[PDB]
Design a binder for this molecule. Structure first.
Ligand SMILES: O=C(N[C@@H](Cc1ccccc1)C(=O)N1CC(C(=O)O)C1)c1cc2cc(Cl)ccc2[nH]1
Ligand SMILES: O=C(N[C@@H](Cc1ccccc1)C(=O)N1CC(C(=O)O)C1)c1cc2cc(Cl)ccc2[nH]1
Ligand SMILES: *Cc1c(COP(=O)(O)O)cnc(C)c1O
Ligand SMILES: *Cc1c(COP(=O)(O)O)cnc(C)c1O
Ligand SMILES: CC(=O)N[C@@H]1O[C@H](CO)[C@@H](O)[C@H](O)[C@H]1O
Ligand SMILES: CC(=O)N[C@@H]1O[C@H](CO)[C@@H](O)[C@H](O)[C@H]1O
Ligand SMILES: O=c1[nH]c(=O)c2[nH]c(=O)[nH]c2[nH]1
Ligand SMILES: O=c1[nH]c(=O)c2[nH]c(=O)[nH]c2[nH]1
Lengths: 793, 791
């Protein structure tokens, strides 16, 4: 692992592994040679780590999720193994540029957004905390689509991420497992049998998860679907049908699409995972009574809800345990995390679909529900409507299964991902269940890993911090509070601002080479990157942008703090409003960026193909972080945390974790604005009439009229009709209701920005208070209050 | 040495497979050893390709839809001179070398002889140091794995890439786009093919090591990938473009005009020519010198589209004038004809080609117009000559005669054995050969002595080497030196011992798989090849039943016992072939369970015959059944394998059987039945199967038994379709050779009773098989068609 030896290993791989010499090698070949050179460093500790779990049998944690938004692996691995500086030197001596090799790697974009990225941060924190934890998901052949912008509109291109090979994954043939679908059920005198099923094989692929500087390397096991081997041509081609189960990730963020294929993916990952878990338990040097003391399975949202009735199926139908005992061990095994409260995102599978595909699971679900309601009928004999409300089944016409209800009764703990969120989940949405079981509902505020989101993406900052207070903060982020000691340290504030500046220059180079636009390197980088959603409101942001443009058009010489406004994110393919909003933004940017009067005063960029590796670039270069969801809509958020950690100030609503960010850093140190949760409720009751604000606010009217009259789309004056219509008559995210307070807030931001010392002092107060948001703290609370597992430091 | 090989093995097990000894699976050990051996290929492979770039010798491109490679581990260890050392390392590591080798999947990207010939050719060309490349398709599924259920063949997908193939190397930087459908636009800027669907071609290189010479050549196989410009359905529909290289069409000697198959043919052809042209432009070489640097061999008519594709490239893209382009095209291409069976002839319907490849149809018409215009000038009156020589067949359904396209587009056309080449030249393509005599040639097939001797039969190879040295491996003609042992009884017993060892080793195989108990004392009678009416395993079956009915009558007669093995795959849609298999499993059930017969005779249908199995059953064979109707087996190569391995041949004067007889002495082979002329006369006179049936009492019983349910009591008329074919539609004259065949078989048994005489004849066969080395075949191709030299 020294420089001379890394060059030798690199040359060795280029030769024997890539079959090339320095004359014919491609950049991809060099990336692969380096990837293998680094990968070899994981082996020893990966084998030892998994071997140690078997010998000492610590209770294991299984994080079951349909998503793992991993981003790239090369750099992350080098950093957690302490190999980056040496590799950087080696590659440089070989006459190459490691950063260029790094760009060849495809993101493992096996997720949509926060839910999937939370899982990824969790694996890093769990390996860093030394827990015997495993991530279980699906090895999608195609991840979240690559986004292109054509004529101002989003276009989707398949993310063929495995086309050239994934050196970071390991096929595990010996652990293949069969998964069953369809068929029929038989209640024989030897137990109930699920027969005449269609079989799809699940081949597992393991990816190492290195902890930060601790010799621990855990595993991420992703399952891939394969047709079993018992017109000939057509029969062989049809093998594709089974293989389509793990073909592509469903691209919806916070939205439920009840497609049968999605249901197939859900049972696929759940069946393979649990059978693999039980297999390992049975081989452990451990009857099943100890199962719950040896296994904890965390449900990442309701997507893997079928795991509950699958575990019961295994215990009852296979292991021959009596229902009562099976049920007991089941509840003690599962814990569920609720990640959302938007109606349209709720998973409610029609009973008929479940009956056809998973007949044995439907039966078990009905039983679960029966024992569920019988107990309620007991405690509350009269309340008939209570039974209707707590039922796992919704019989209102098209009968369907309420997966969240199934997760609640089958789990011993249910948690939200931010205080305000967990409160609403416990006291509103699931009141009937929490009153019945107080101690079941918990909170576990989200977090982000400071390796990827600090050390990796912003080395200049990580280094500056380390020089002031040491490196202990990497593994204990609450150590950042020591930074408070430097609030009056002028030289340190200058050093802090220089790091932001350099990040800004570096990213301005990315922008200019990727887009036409000329970037004012000194302007304020106002950023909003996240999935496109009406509730996240990049639309509100767009109104503010148009507002700023008009102010410039009117008073061209007024002292204006220059800005580069960046907005990026993917829209789900079938989400019409989301796609219209993107087109609006690109249209606005085209006018702004090409109007001679504004020039270098204001530049607008719709950041294309926002994904993990691109978040690592833009976040460190950000001055103002846009976290403006309508109060009550963002369960927690985590992008908000990344910006805080990287030196940006936040303009947002009192929503999700924005509330706890305010508590930690001091509310005066964030630009909070708009309606809070109570204001939204009150405005609801009264009835929200969008027209009022439009008529009542002149700057807003001009904006609205311009969008509506074709100012931003001359060739198609009515192009934005749907946006206008939704805004006046169907906006449940009250865009106009926060417009005023939002714009007033934005002006205060510009005011502060003119005061570099005041601005950087507040930045320091944010960075110094960001410690709570490390996923290491989130995982400690999960380990202690839910999984009952302990580290190894 | 051995210490370093063991060290690399442990290094690969650890870093490449992520395992230690107490957790490794047998498959990890195989992969670890494969990687250890593979590393030894790299230096020479890089050097060999670099050398071709540096000295720019003319390059040979063998374009085929099939490469029946089999397993690669052992073959690589042998050709690299590493087997003993690796055998030692694995032994010292406490592992079973044979167990690891059996883990490897056959790369079965071929149907039978056509695809195996390409593989043997790759090995010989690399061993002769020719700058040669193989170009084909990387099918996800090769020829299906065959199982027998209730006596019938059942097919399973050959998912050979499931666990990974260490022997292939993806070459991402050489991915190319291939076009389909679309339309032709005739502009003032020059005719363009527009609005096409695109499919990417990703090449994968597999190294081809020559035997002990530092040469490592390349076999480049193409895999179809969808390009990247309802969302979910759009992503799933990428499966459609990728279906082009999904599976090998399971037909041997049969034309199935499916569209997907036409797509595969254009795919390999389009990717291949573009890549070849790209390599020409990058070389240190206008195009005038293209044919002096490039030779492309068309393996049968399957890649015939390559002729109009090269023209399309030269003309539509490179803007060369038609005349110039056509001249270059003919000098580049050479066509190998592999069959004369009418059902095997590729004739694509014009409508299909126009829909999928409209610009190629226009080009084909043009080539045809210019072609017929020449014929009109040389024979003004001969109207029918134009009809017989046109690439187009206008009768009702217009279709393209791909064979004709290949002939007019090539400078050399060859068959694969004397008898066949003569038929192709003076009969099937008489109007063409008469116009250009020199164009048609012969190149008798061969098999590589590495895979088919040194590897599959180490015992025989060691015996031969002990007596005549090792020079024969690279110069098989040296086998004639074994004649010096014609009298030696010590050598003859040695020879018989080796055969015994193989029979014993293989017998152990047959019983762990089959219920039957083998008589080790018995003569191994083997017919392994694809199930075909023309190959006649049916005739063989008539003999087995004939033999059974003889034992039943005279249980006490002195009889040479036999283990009769017949094995082969039937094309899934080939009904007769499938009936024939059911007939054989049925007959075997009756014979194998009859108390009165017992160890006197046993029958086995060898399931899943394929390259790795062939390597086992061939060296254990005493009698090789090569009985196609005279004129139907263009050449055959299994005949040659058996000859090299110590088996005597019972066969017709067909394909290369004729030449085997010329080399070893007609009396040293058991030749029988009708010859090309006799079949010709019988056809003239008309064939009435009933006659031989009436005239031959042993035959009558055999048939009545089949037809009345003797071999299928549960379903008495099960073989009705077979009876109907033998009597009123048997164009391969099974009954007409029944009598001579049975008599011939009796003579085989006679000689078998005399061990010294039997092995004396084997020696004469092994000593005369030198001609059948693919190394001899390749040299002829090199000198007379491609105009290239070794190194
Ligand atoms: O596949 C080889 N190396 C591998 C190296 C590799 C492995 C994993 C990820 C990226 C690269 C290779 O090039 N790829 C695997 C990818 C795929 O599956 O498409 C691409 C290889 C080396 C080699 C050397 C010889 Cl001599 C013969 C065959 C060989 N294959
Ligand atoms: O895939 C790895 N090695 C390879 C080794 C290999 C390569 C080619 C054929 C067989 C085996 C592997 O196991 N396979 C490629 C096959 C496939 O395509 O499914 C199976 C590998 C090694 C490794 C080491 C670490 Cl630390 C992490 C991930 C890793 N993957
Ligand atoms: C962190 C992250 C998210 C979640 O961001 P929010 O602003 O909390 O919605 C989404 N996508 C990517 C690529 C991320 O890295
Ligand atoms: C050699 C070979 C053949 C060709 O056999 P013929 O008897 O010439 O048809 C067919 N299949 C396999 C697997 C072979 O090795
Ligand atoms: C269904 C879903 O994707 N929910 C998302 O989950 C992440 C992780 O908890 C939250 O931060 C975010 O606010 C929320 O929208
Ligand atoms: C079309 C086809 O598969 N033809 C086969 O080709 C091989 C290779 O030349 C011959 O040995 C054999 O007789 C013949 O049947
Ligand atoms: O197809 C959709 N995907 C979504 O993510 C979404 N969100 C929404 O409101 N509608 C839709 N539609
Ligand atoms: O599907 C078929 N494959 C063949 O190889 C063949 N041969 C034949 O005569 N008929 C058929 N059918």
């Amino acid at each position: 692992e020294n420089v001379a030896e890394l060059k030798k290993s690199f040359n060795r791989h280029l030769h024997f592994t890539l079959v090339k010499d320095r004359n014919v090698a491609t950049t991809r070949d060099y990336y692969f040679a380096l990837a293998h050179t680094v990968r070899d460093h994981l082996v020893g500790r990966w084998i030892r780590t998994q071997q140690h779990y078997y010998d000492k049998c610590p209770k294991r944690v299984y994080y079951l999720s349909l998503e793992f938004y991993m981003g790239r692996t090369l750099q992350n691995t080098m950093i957690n193994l302490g190999l980056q500086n040496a590799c950087d030197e080696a590659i440089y001596q070989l006459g190459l540029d490691i950063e260029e090799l790094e760009e060849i790697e495809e993101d493992a974009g096996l997720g949509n957004g926060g839910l999937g990225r939370l899982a990824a941060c969790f694996l890093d924190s769990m390996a860093t905390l030394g827990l015997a934890a495993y991530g279980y998901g699906i090895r999608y052949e195609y991840g979240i689509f690559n986004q292109k912008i054509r004529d101002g509109w989003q276009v989707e291109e398949a993310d063929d991420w495995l086309r050239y090979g994934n050196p970071w994954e390991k096929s595990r043939p010996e652990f293949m497992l069969p998964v069953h679908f369809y068929g029929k059920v038989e209640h024989t005198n030897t137990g109930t049998k699920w027969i005449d099923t269609q079989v799809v094989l699940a081949l597992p692929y393991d990816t190492p998860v290195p902890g930060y500087m601790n010799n621990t390397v855990n595993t991420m096991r992703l399952w891939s679907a394969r047709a079993p081997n018992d017109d000939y041509i057509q029969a062989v081609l049809d093998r594709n049908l089974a293989e389509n189960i793990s073909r592509v990730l469903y691209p919806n963020d916070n939205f439920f699409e009840g497609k049968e294929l999605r249901l197939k993916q859900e049972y696929f990952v759940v069946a393979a995972t649990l059978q693999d878990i039980i297999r390992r338990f049975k081989a452990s040097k451990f009857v099943f009574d100890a199962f719950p003391d040896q296994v904890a399975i965390q449900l990442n949202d309701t997507h893997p809800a079928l795991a509950i009735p699958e575990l019961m199926r295994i215990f009852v139908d296979i292991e021959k345990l009596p229902w009562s005992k099976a049920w007991e061990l089941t509840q003690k095994t599962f814990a569920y995390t609720n990640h959302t409260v938007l109606p349209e995102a709720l998973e409610r599978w029609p009973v008929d679909l479940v009956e056809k595909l998973l007949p044995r699971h439907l039966e078990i679900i009905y039983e679960i529900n029966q024992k569920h309601l019988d107990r309620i009928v007991a405690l509350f004999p009269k309340d008939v409507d209570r039974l209707r409300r707590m039922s796992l089944i919704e019989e209102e016409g098209s009968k369907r299964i309420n997966m969240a209800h199934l997760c609640i009764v089958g789990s011993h703990a249910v948690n939200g991902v931010a205080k305000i969120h967990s409160d609403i989940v416990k006291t509103k949405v699931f009141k009937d269940f929490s009153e019945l079981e107080p101690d079941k509902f918990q909170n576990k505020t989200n977090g982000i890993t400071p390796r990827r989101w600090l050390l990796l993406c912003n080395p200049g900052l990580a280094e500056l911090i380390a020089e002031k207070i040491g490196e202990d903060y990497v593994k204990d982020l609450s150590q950042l509070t020591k930074l408070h000691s430097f609030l009056g340290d002028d030289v340190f504030l200058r050093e802090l601002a220089k790091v932001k500046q350099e990040n800004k220059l570096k990213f301005s180079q990315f922008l200019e080479t990727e887009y036409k636009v000329k970037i004012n390197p000194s302007s304020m980088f106002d950023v909003q990157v996240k999935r496109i959603h009406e509730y996240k409101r990049q639309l509100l942001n767009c109104l503010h942008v148009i507002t700023m443009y008009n102010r410039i058009k009117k008073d061209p010489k007024k002292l204006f703090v220059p800005r580069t406004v960046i907005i990026g994110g993917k829209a789900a393919p079938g989400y019409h409003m989301a796609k219209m909003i993107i087109k609006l933004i690109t249209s606005v940017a085209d006018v702004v960026n090409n109007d001679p009067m504004v020039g270098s005063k204001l530049k607008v960029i719709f950041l294309e193909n926002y994904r993990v590796s691109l978040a690592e670039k833009v976040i460190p270069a950000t001055d103002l972080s846009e976290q403006i969801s309508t109060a009550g809509t963002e369960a927690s958020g985590t992008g908000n945390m990344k910006f805080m950690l990287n030196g940006a100030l936040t303009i947002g609503t009192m929503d999700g974790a924005n509330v706890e960010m305010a508590e930690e850093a001091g509310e005066e140190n964030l630009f909070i604005f708009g309606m809070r949760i109570d204001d939204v409720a009150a405005l609801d009751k009264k009835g929200y009439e969008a027209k009022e604000y439009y008529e009542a606010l002149p700057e807003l009217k001009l904006v609205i009229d311009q969008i509506d009259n074709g100012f931003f789309s001359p060739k198609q004056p009515d192009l934005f009709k749907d946006i206008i219509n939704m805004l006046f008559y169907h906006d449940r995210f009250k865009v106009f209701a926060d417009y005023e307070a939002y714009v007033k807030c934005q002006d205060k931001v510009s005011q502060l920005y003119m005061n570099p010392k005041a601005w950087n002092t507040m930045v320091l107060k944010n960075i110094a208070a960001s410690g709570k948001f490390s996923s290491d703290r989130t995982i400690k609370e999960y380990a202690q209050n839910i999984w009952n597992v302990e580290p190894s430091d």
